[PDB]
Design a protein that fits this description.
This protein is an alpha+beta fold. The protein has three helices and five strands; from the N terminus they run ββααβββα. The structure holds flavin mononucleotide. The site of flavin mononucleotide has 21 residues, from β1, α2, β3, β4 and β5.
């Protein structure tokens, strides 16, 4: 499983954990991504309209699934089916965000443009 956990109580909602698979996919070592917002995976061909939907889902604390282009450390592109989910503690208070990444062009690109 490719996934990261971020802490929205810390400035700029930084990564506090990244799985081994996520590091292999993105070509980053854990030390150079901890404490950073996961936006470093976006690049020139990333649809900003899709990024806007992630921004709203984090604001409203809703789960969302989108497909978008991301970049590995060396600049290699990959399609990312991205599922974001809020994690709440026993008191029903927002505690973490978990983002799961599935690499592949699952939804055909010409259908996604609609
Ligand atoms: C847990 C978590 C995982 C995320 N994973 C990705 C990702 O894999 N790819 C991506 O493009 N954005 C991902 N994001 C979204 C960015 O981190 C960021 O929230 C988005 O770009 C909007 O924020 P910004 O406008 O300040 O950059 C993730 C966000 C969270 C909270």
């Amino acid at each position: 499983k490719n996934f990261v956990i971020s802490d929205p109580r810390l400035p700029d909602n930084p990564i506090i954990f990244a799985s081994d698979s996520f590091l292999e996919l993105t070509e980053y070592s854990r030390e150079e991504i901890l404490g950073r917002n996961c936006r470093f995976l976006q690049g020139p061909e990333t649809d900003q309209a899709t990024v806007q939907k992630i921004r709203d889902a984090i604001r409203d604390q809703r789960e969302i699934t989108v497909q978008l282009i991301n970049y590995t450390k060396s600049g290699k592109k990959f399609w990312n089916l991205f599922h974001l989910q809020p994690m709440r503690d026993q008191k029903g208070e927002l505690q973490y965000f978990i983002g799961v990444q599935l690499d592949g062009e699952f939804i055909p690109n010409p259908l996604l443009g609609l």
